[PDB]
Symmetry: C3
C-alpha cells in the first residue's frame, strides 16, 4: 500500500529493546508559577542603589530576574541619544543575598557579557532608532526623546535548568540589590545639550520582576553555583593576577580602553546603525563637510594651521606621496573646488612622519546643488578604518602633537559627541582590533596555557554559539546542574593558588593617535561555590 514492499519484508524479536515510541509520563512536583513584580527602595551611596526584598511564605522558589526601567522624557536643546542596550549599561553591580550573606553577585559588564549572545534580551534592554539614534532639540521645550520603558534580563545560574536550577527560599529573606552607573555612562550628547541640569533631574525608576513558584511539599537538595570575579590590571600594564583560586570552572581574558586622559568627546557616532561600516561611514560623512569645499576664492572659517589647496584642472591634489582625486559636477563659474590637505594631523617630531586623515582619501566625487548651495557626495574612495572613528578629539589636540591637530571648522567641532559607554572593549568601538599578540596563563610558577592566536576565543565563540566571545579557558565540560562542575584543583603549598595572566601587546606607531589610548587587562574567574539550604540559604567557597 502506502509503505513500500522492500520495507515490510526488511522487518516482517530475540533481543531486549528500549522503547523509543512511548514513555512513562512522570508525575512532577505539585507547583504553581506566578510573574511577581516588586517596587524597590532607592538609596544614594552618591551612587544609585535599588533594594528589592523578597519575603513570602508561599514564594518557595524563584528564577528569571527582569529589571524594568522607566526612561523619562528628554526636553531641551542640543544633540542627545542613549547607548545601545541602554538597560544593561545602567547596571553597575547586582547582588542576590540572604540573611547568611551574598548568594550570588555580578558586575554590570559581566551580566552584559553573558547576555551578548541573547538577541531577545539585548532588544528588550533598549535597542531601537527611537532610543539609540542621536536626536536633536531646537527649542528649550522641544522633545529630544519620548519616555520609554526598558527590560533588563538579569541572567543568573538559577535559569540554567528552569525549575531544577531555581533559587529555593527556606522561609528566608532574599534581597536583590542593584547598583547603578551614573547617567553619564548611558548617554551620548554634544556641548549644546544641558547635561548639568539633566544629571540633576534624572532619577533611575526600577522595578524587579521574577518567576515565583509555590511548591507543595518541596524536597530541597544542595546545589552548586559559579560566581564571577573580575580583576582589572593597572593602566597600560600587560599583567593581572587573580588570587585565592581554589576551584575555577572558567577563566576569561579581555582588554578595555581607559579614556581618563581624554574629555570622552569623539568626532562621529552612527546611532542605532551599529555595523563597522556604519561607524566608518558616519566619520567619513562628518569629515566631508570640511574635506571638500566649493567656495568663491579661498575658504574662510578654518584655523591658520589649516592648508586648503585648490583642486587643479587634472583633478589630482598631491599631499606628499598620497594622491587625492576630487571632481565635483555643476560647480558655478564664480566658484572653485578646494581640498583640506591636513584636516586632522599628528606628529611627535618637527620634520618626521605625519598621520594625516586627508591622506586616507583617494577619490571624492559629487555634484554641487544650486538650490541648497551644498555639495552632494556620490562616491568616496578611502582607507578610513574603525580605529580612526574611535580616536577621542583630545588626542588630536594633545601636548605630544607638534602640529595643531584638529584643523576642522568651528561648526564641525561643535557637532562632537561625548561617549562614556562603560562596556567598551579593546581599542576601537567595534572591538575589532586584537591588540593581544600573545597570551600566557600561569597557575603558580608553571604555565597553564599559552597561545599566539585567539584560538581560546574561537573555542568560546563555537562552544557557546556566540558571535562576540572572549579569550576563555573552560575547565568544565560536564553537564550543568545535574553534575558537580569540573574545576581546576589548586595546590596552596606549591604556590599554585593564584592565576597570573600575561599578555604581549601589539606594537603601534608613535605618530598614530591610537598609541596614546591607555589599555587595561581584564581577567574574569568563575569560582565554584556550594549552595547549602540548612538553616537558611548560604554559599560556601570550594577549597
Amino acid at each position: 500500500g502506502a509503505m513500500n514492499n522492500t520495507i515490510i519484508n526488511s522487518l516482517i524479536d530475540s533481543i531486549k529493546r528500549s522503547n523509543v515510541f512511548a514513555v512513562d509520563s512522570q508525575i512532577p512536583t505539585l507547583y504553581m508559577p506566578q510573574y511577581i513584580s516588586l517596587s524597590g527602595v532607592m538609596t544614594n551611596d552618591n551612587q544609585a542603589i535599588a533594594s528589592f526584598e523578597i519575603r513570602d511564605q508561599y514564594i518557595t522558589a524563584l528564577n528569571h530576574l527582569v529589571l524594568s526601567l522607566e526612561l523619562p522624557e528628554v526636553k531641551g536643546m542640543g544633540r542627545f541619544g542613549y547607548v545601545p542596550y541602554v538597560g544593561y549599561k545602567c547596571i553597575n553591580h547586582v547582588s542576590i543575598s540572604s540573611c547568611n550573606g551574598v548568594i550570588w553577585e555580578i558586575e554590570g559588564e559581566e551580566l552584559y557579557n553573558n547576555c551578548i549572545n541573547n538577541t531577545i534580551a539585548l532588544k528588550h534592554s533598549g535597542y531601537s532608532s527611537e532610543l539609540n539614534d542621536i536626536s536633536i532639540g531646537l527649542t528649550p521645550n522641544d522633545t529630544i526623546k519620548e519616555p520609554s520603558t526598558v527590560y533588563v534580563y538579569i541572567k543568573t545560574p538559577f535559569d540554567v535548568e528552569d525549575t531544577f536550577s531555581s533559587l529555593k527560599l527556606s522561609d528566608s529573606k532574599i534581597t536583590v540589590t542593584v547598583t547603578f552607573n551614573p547617567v553619564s555612562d548611558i548617554v551620548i550628547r554634544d556641548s549644546s545639550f544641558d547635561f548639568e541640569t539633566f544629571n540633576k533631574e534624572f532619577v533611575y525608576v526600577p522595578e524587579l520582576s521574577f518567576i515565583g513558584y509555590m511548591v507543595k511539599n518541596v524536597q530541597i537538595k544542595p546545589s552548586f553555583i559559579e560566581k564571577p570575579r573580575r580583576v582589572i590590571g593597572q593602566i597600560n600594564q600587560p599583567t593581572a593576577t587573580v588570587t585565592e583560586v581554589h576551584a575555577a570552572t572558567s577563566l576569561s581574558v579581555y582588554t578595555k580602553p581607559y579614556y581618563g586622559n581624554t574629555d570622552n568627546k569623539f568626532i562621529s557616532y552612527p546611532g542605532y546603525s551599529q555595523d563597522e561600516k556604519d561607524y566608518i561611514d558616519a566619520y567619513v560623512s562628518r569629515l566631508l563637510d570640511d574635506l571638500v569645499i566649493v567656495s568663491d576664492g579661498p575658504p574662510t572659517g578654518y584655523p591658520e594651521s589649516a592648508e586648503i589647496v585648490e583642486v587643479p584642472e587634472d583633478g589630482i591634489v598631491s599631499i606628499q606621496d598620497a594622491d587625492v582625486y576630487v571632481k565635483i559636477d555643476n560647480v558655478p563659474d564664480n566658484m572653485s573646488v578646494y581640498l583640506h590637505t591636513n584636516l586632522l594631523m599628528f606628529g611627535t617630531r618637527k620634520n618626521s612622519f605625519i598621520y594625516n586623515i586627508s591622506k586616507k582619501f583617494s577619490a571624492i566625487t559629487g555634484t554641487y546643488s544650486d538650490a541648497t548651495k551644498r555639495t552632494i557626495f556620490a562616491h568616496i574612495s578611502h582607507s578610513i578604518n574603525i580605529i580612526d572613528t574611535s580616536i577621542p578629539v583630545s588626542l588630536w589636540t594633545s601636548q605630544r602633537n607638534v602640529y595643531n591637530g584638529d584643523n576642522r571648522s568651528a561648526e564641525s567641532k561643535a557637532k562632537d559627541l561625548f561617549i562614556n559607554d562603560p562596556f567598551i572593549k579593546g581599542i576601537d568601538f567595534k572591538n575589532k582590533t586584537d591588540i593581544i599578540s600573545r597570551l600566557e596563563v600561569r597557575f603558580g610558577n608553571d604555565v597553564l596555557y599559552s597561545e599566539n592566536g585567539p584560538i581560546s576565543r574561537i573555542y568560546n565563540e563555537l562552544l557557546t554559539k556566540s558571535n562576540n566571545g572572549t579569550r576563555t579557558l573552560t575547565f568544565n565540560f560536564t553537564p550543568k546542574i545535574f553534575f558537580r562542575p569540573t574545576t581546576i584543583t589548586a595546590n596552596v603549598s606549591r604556590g599554585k593558588d593564584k592565576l597570573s595572566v600575561r599578555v604581549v601587546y601589539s606594537t603601534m606607531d608613535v605618530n598614530h593617535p591610537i598609541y596614546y589610548v591607555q589599555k587595561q587587562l581584564v581577567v574574569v574567574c568563575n569560582d565554584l561555590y556550594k549552595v547549602s539550604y540548612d538553616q537558611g540559604v548560604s554559599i560556601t567557597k570550594i577549597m
Copy 2:
C-alpha cells in the same frame, strides 16, 4: 568515591522501526468554503509525525497589480484537524499554527517568502504573466513532533483523517482595482498534498500520553472582555489583539512587498505620497480635488503649514515651471475647531533634482516623522463620516494605485504589530483575580522564555519538560465556581483626531487545555477534569 561516567555510555538498542516519507493526494470539497480530506489507513503505518502540506499556486496572467501575502502557505490555512473513528485527536486554527511557527525561519521560508511571490508585480496586457506558478510547503507543527519518535501519533489498524479547511483566496492576495479579482476568485482552486514521516514499528509497545489542545475565543468588535468557559486543566493562556477592517474596503495607500522591515513599510508610504506631495508644474497643479491646498514654495524654500515648517528645494527646475507643495495631502479632524492630523505636516525636508529627459522629479533626501501606524491606516478611515474634512486629497492617479490587503493574521493596530494597545491586563480564574499587569511583562517573559521576537501576553503554567512528564496545569474547582478564565483589558488612550483611533479591535484569548491520549480500542482523547 562513586563517580558517574561522562566519557562513555551504553548504546541502548531501540525499538525496531523503519521511517518513510509518505505523500497523499486528498479529496476537495466546498458550504461555500474549500476543504481537503486526507485519509491515512495502512496496517504497516504504525506511527506518524511531521505533517507538511504542499500547495501548487497557479500561473497568474492578466492586467493590474498582484502579489501573495508573506508566508502565503500559512495564511491559506483556516483550520486543521487530525481525527480518528473515536473523534478529533488534535485541531488548530490557521492563525494559531502560524503563531506556533513564527519562530521557525525554515518553516516560514518554505511556506512562501520570496521576491518572486511577495513583491507586488504588474500585468500590462491581458496575456502578460504577473506571477509564475510555484509550489509552497506548509509545516503543520503538531504536539507529535516535540520528542520525534517518542511524541509521534500511534495508529495501529485505526483510520486517521487529516482535514484542512482553507481561507478564501482574497485573504492570501494583495491586488489593486485594475486586477480582475472577480475572474481570479472563480478560476482559483487550492491544489493540496499532505506529506508525513510514517513509521513501521516491529512489536510496538504503546503507553498512554498527554496532549495540549489550543482553544481560541474572539471577543465582540471593540469589547475589552473575553471568557474561555470549562477551563479545568490549562498549560498556558495567551492574550492578543486583532484589528477588524469590516467598516473599511480593506484598501491601503502603500505596501512594500517582500521587504518586510518597519523602515521598508515606511519608505514605501513616503515613496507613494511624494508623487503628490511635491509637484513641479507650469502654474498651479491640476488634477487634485478642490479641498486640496497646494502652495507654491517661496525663494526661501520654507513652506509653513501652521507651526510645522517644510523645507523644499528641487534642482534643475525649468524657468517656466515652479515648485509646489501639497499642504494637506491627508488630513483628519472630528470638529472644525479641533486638532488636525495632517500627513504633510509630518515632513520637514524634501530635496531632489528635476529630470528634463523623463519630465519627473527624482527625490534625493527626505526628512520626515512618518511611523508604522501611518502606513497601516485604511484609506476608508481618512474619508470617514467622523472627518469634517475631505480626507484623501491625493491625485486620481495615486488613489488608483491603492492595494486591497486582507491578511487574516494581522495583530494589533499596525502591519508590523509594533504598537501595544493594551494599557492594563486582568485575568480572572472563576471570579478571583489570577493575574494583573500594567506593563507587558508577561509578553517580555514569553519572548525571553521562547527566544522569540514576536510574542504575546502569555501566562505559562507548565515549566515541566514536555512528553517525559505529565504537564503542570491550573487546577479547577467547579463547586467554588473556578471553572473558567475571564480576560479584561484596558485599551491605551489616543487622540480622537488621529485616524487610527477608528480601527475596530478584537480581543483574542487562547487556552491550551490538557487531554489524555488513550490507545485502548483505537486512538481517543479525553479532557482532563
Copy 3:
C-alpha cells in the same frame, strides 16, 4: 506576593522532584586546548599530518584547523572565496594504528557546517577577505595577511565528553588540501603563476584534549559518509555494499571542465541573489549605454550599437528598451548596444540576447568624470545569467560572435574555481531534478516528483540550504544504537541505486551547455571497539 486564588488551588501519589536534583560526582578529568604544528607533504596535492600521542591526553573532540593566509602583494584583481577555510579542505581522516577511524570529503564537512553561522564566519567570511581587491603597483598590498579557523565537525562532538574520541594509542589527523586555484577569485592582470608557486598552506590543528583519571571506556557507534560522483551528465549513480545506512543525500554539481572558469561578474562579500544580479547588471551597463560624439569605437565589428531616438525607445526585435540619460553634451548622443551578449545554434533561429533582458535605463552624464551615472534600471536578469561562464558565449556551438563587449570590460572578467558549487547557478536556486528514484537492491525504496525530502532535510536540521536526504535514523544519537536500513545479501539487496530525471533546458540558452554531476552521499554505520587500540568495524 502570591495571589489568594493560587494558594487555595494547592493548600499518596509518587512524584518526581523537578525543583532539586542530586549533584552526581562526574569522572575526574581535566580539559586543555592543545594546538599542534603538522608535517607538510606533496597531482602534488598539499597534505598535512598531525600526530596525537600523549600519556596525559585520554580523549579528544572539537577539531579546529587554523590557516595562516599570507600577504598578497602585486597588481590586478584578487579575492578569496566565501568561507575560504572550508574550501581549502579536500579530505580529512582521523586514523589509528588499526586504520581509519573516521574520514570526510572537504565538501561534506562544509555541508555539515552550512547551518553553523559561527563556524562559517571563523573560516573566513569578511569584506577584508571576500571582496575583490585591486593592486595597482607591483608592491601594492592587495590582501593583508589573516588567520582563518576551520571547525572540523566530527561525530565525537555530538554529546561533548560522552561522544569524545578515546585514545588511551597514536591518532593521526591527515588533512588533504585543494589547490590554491580553488580558493581564489582573480583576473588576467593578476600574476597567478607566481602566486601558485609562492603560496604554501600553513596549518595548525587544535583540539580539546581531556586527561581522565581512571577512564571507563565502553564501545560506541559512528556514522561514516561515503560520496559517489556519477559520470558527467549521467542521471544515475550507485552506492555499493550498503548494509547499515543511517541516511542518504542526493544533490547535483556543475562541471566546468569545458570552460576556462572565467565569469563576467562577482559581487564579493555581498552573497545575496540580488547582490549577484546587481554586480552583473553593473558590469554590463558600462558597454550597454554609451554617451559618445558619433558612433562608439573600441567594440567588435559584430556589435550593433544603435542611437537612441528622441522617443527614447529602441526596438531590439519584439523587446523594447527605454533609454533616457540627463545632462548629455550638445556634441554627444545616447547609444545602446543591442547585442552585448548573444547566443544561437542556427543563423536565423531563436537568439538569447542579454540586451533584450533590459526594459528601462535612466541616468545622468557627469561632465567632470566624463562617465554616465545610472539611477534606475528595469531588467529581467536572473541568477542563471550571472552564472554563465564566458567560454560558453564564445563557444563553437554559437553561430554569432557571442561576446560583443569592449576590451576594457573583457579584461575585468574573473576566474572562479570554487570547489563546493551546487546546481547550475552560484546561489543553487534552480532546481534541475524533476524526479528522484532510489532503489535498494532491485526494489524501489523511495520515489518523489517534488523536493519533499529536501523540505524535510531543511526542516529537521533547521538549515536554509539542504539536500534531497532520506533519513533512516530518528533515534537519539550516542545514547542509542542508530536505526539503519537492513540489507539482504541473498536477495541482492546490498546496494543503493539513485536515478534522477533532469529538467531539460533550451539549447539556445548558454546554461544548457553547463555540464552536470550527480552526487550521492551514504552514511554507513560502524562500531567503535577499544580492545587493543581504537578500531572501527562495518555493521553487516
